Design a protein around this ligand. Structure first.
Ligand SMILES: CC(=O)N[C@@H]1[C@@H](O)[C@H](O[C@@H]2O[C@H](CO)[C@@H](O)[C@H](O)[C@H]2NC(C)=O)[C@@H](CO)O[C@H]1O
Length: 539
């Protein structure tokens, strides 16, 4: 007679190919990449002959075999592909095999293959669009927005994007290497702890709790190996396999290490660590380089060199060569992008006409033209054109685009930026002919989260009523709200100015639109980005 039917023992059924150490703060100890997950199964036979060979089947296919030597047994084996498997134990003898009932096991991998898709409803005023225009529609999600801003990955209107950028992946380094971090409370120290035992100029994760361990929708079970932003982004990938999810390296306070990369020893180490990062976190589709800025004038007044333009071009070439190698190793397409200043003085420090051949998209940061960092010279922070009262205005979207085009940049490489936030001053005074920008300011506007900056959501909800004037400058293509009693002035993007930007992209055959930052929108801005680029409504 064939053996009796085995009973699978109660036990852990969740295993991981990339293991996360739950009691570690250093990136080196936090994640362990393996070739395969170590899986274990046990069984009991309560009735009959135990057979002579015991087998573990995954979807009917043997993953382990051994002699059946007792009424209880244990099998330890490796599984090298993520997913969910119907696991059975079978006991075989010459008269037949008898298989247990199936027990599902989970083999986790960083592509999210073990995760149910994160298909969440659109919130606030977001409306569904199809990504059928062929244009880029991108936005940055910020790692730290899961705290005070309470904006998690399940709130991303993901179907309305082609590109989702994750700000920011840091570059390891202490004194002299990340000094700009020291201006943010605890930020420098958090990176040093993450980078303990890790060489300078390798990438890491700045807030491993937010990125990997904070409970979030769809990743709340204690033995879910990936939680936080990364876990949710994995599940988001499962729901939207065509979404490009790019890690962004740099930003305003994490850009200092780029300035040392004229040393090819450091550059090589950085490029190698980006490759390892992408082999580790398989849901990511490439890399975004947010170096602010080649040549200086970033957060750090002690950094910036005329060599930076050559360093940038070399970095883009070597990153592309690494990504090409990754691409043919995996059969995937990987993208290389960069967020760049839109000011002509900064643009002409770099030969983008050369670098463009390595790059899929240039995210032109056509915003922060004006703000509370300058209380004397006011203007539209993100306008398309110069205003009528100052047609020679240096800092406009068109002037940044024109600088790139004059270098020889192909128009299709250029993605125009929109702002999901306003910048603002207080105490504006001494202006002429009812144009508050011709005056001067006494300080920053009170901000949503920091001085001088207001979420678009708060502008729409709070500063579009009462005493606030509203004006759409049709020459600049830029709205602004003004409270005369206090001199509060805010410059921002709205649905109409975004529409002008989208129409401009289509007319000049540019690459699309991207935005900073996705948590601050109520839907109006992203809706207009999709509509103005010719994306069809619907799902
Ligand atoms: C366009 C331009 O050159 N103007 C400068 C601003 O860009 C710059 O502000 C900084 O802009 C970066 C994007 O270009 C932002 O990412 C960065 O957060 C921002 N920094 C601050 C402090 O807001 C300011 C520097 O303050 O100078 C303008 O000249």
């Amino acid at each position: 007679a064939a053996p009796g039917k085995p009973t699978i023992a109660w036990g852990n059924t969740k295993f991981a190919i990339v293991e996360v150490d739950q009691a570690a703060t250093a990136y080196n100890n936090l994640v362990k990449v393996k070739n395969a997950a170590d899986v274990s199964v046990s069984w009991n036979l309560w009735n009959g002959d135990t057979g002579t060979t015991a087998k573990v089947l995954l979807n009917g296919k043997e993953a382990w075999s051994g002699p059946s030597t007792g009424s209880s047994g244990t099998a330890n084996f490796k599984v090298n592909k993520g997913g969910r498997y119907q696991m059975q134990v079978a006991l075989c003898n010459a008269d037949g095999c008898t298989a247990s009932d199936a027990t599902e096991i989970v083999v986790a991998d960083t592509d999210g293959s073990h995760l149910a898709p994160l298909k969440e409803p659109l919130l606030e005023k977001n409306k569904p669009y199809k990504q059928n225009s062929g244009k880029v529609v991108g936005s940055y999600f910020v790692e730290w927005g899961v705290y005070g801003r309470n904006f998690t990955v399940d709130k991303i209107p993901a179907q309305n994007l082609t590109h989702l950028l994750y700000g920011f992946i840091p570059i390891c380094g202490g004194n002299g290497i990340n000094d700009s971090l020291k201006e943010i409370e605890g930020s420098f120290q958090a990176l040093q702890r993450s980078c303990q035992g890790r060489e300078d100029f390798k990438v890491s994760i700045h807030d491993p709790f937010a990125a990997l361990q904070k409970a979030q929708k769809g990743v709340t079970a204690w033995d879910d190996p990936y939680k936080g932003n990364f876990g949710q982004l994995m599940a988001l990938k499962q729901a939207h396999p065509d979404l490009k999810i790019l890690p962004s390296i740099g930003g305003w306070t994490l850009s200092d290490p780029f300035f040392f990369m004229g040393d090819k020893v450091k550059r090589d180490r950085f490029v190698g660590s980006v490759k390892e990062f992408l082999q580790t976190w398989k849901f990511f589709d490439g890399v975004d380089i947010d170096w602010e800025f080649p040549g200086g004038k970033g957060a750090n007044p002690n950094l910036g060199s005329p060599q930076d333009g050559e360093t940038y071009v070399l970095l883009m070439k070597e990153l592309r060569a690494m990504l090409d190698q990754l691409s043919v190793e995996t059969g995937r397409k990987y993208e290389l992008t960069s967020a760049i200043s839109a000011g002509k003085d900064k643009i002409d420090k770099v030969a983008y006409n050369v670098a463009q051949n390595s790059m899929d998209h240039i995210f032109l940061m056509s915003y922060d033209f004006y703000g509370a960092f300058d209380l004397k010279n006011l203007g539209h922070q993100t306008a398309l054109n110069a205003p009528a009262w100052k047609p020679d205005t240096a800092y406009t979207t068109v002037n940044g685009v024109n600088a790139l085009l004059a270098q020889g940049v192909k128009p299709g490489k250029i993605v125009v930026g929109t702002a999901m936030y306003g910048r603002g001053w207080t105490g504006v005074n001494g202006y002429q002919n009812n144009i508050p920008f011709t005056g001067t300011a006494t300080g920053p506007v009170k901000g949503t989260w920091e001085n001088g900056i207001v979420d678009y959501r708060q502008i729409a909800g709070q500063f579009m009523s009462g005493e606030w004037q509203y004006t759409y400058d049709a020459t600049a293509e830029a709205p602004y709200v003004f409270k005369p009693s206090t001199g509060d002035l805010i410059t921002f993007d709205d649905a109409r100015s975004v529409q002008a930007k989208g129409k401009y992209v289509l007319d000049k055959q540019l690459g699309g639109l991207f935005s900073w930052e996705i948590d601050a929108d109520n839907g109006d801005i992203l809706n207009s980005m999709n509509a103005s680029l010719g994306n069809s409504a619907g799902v």
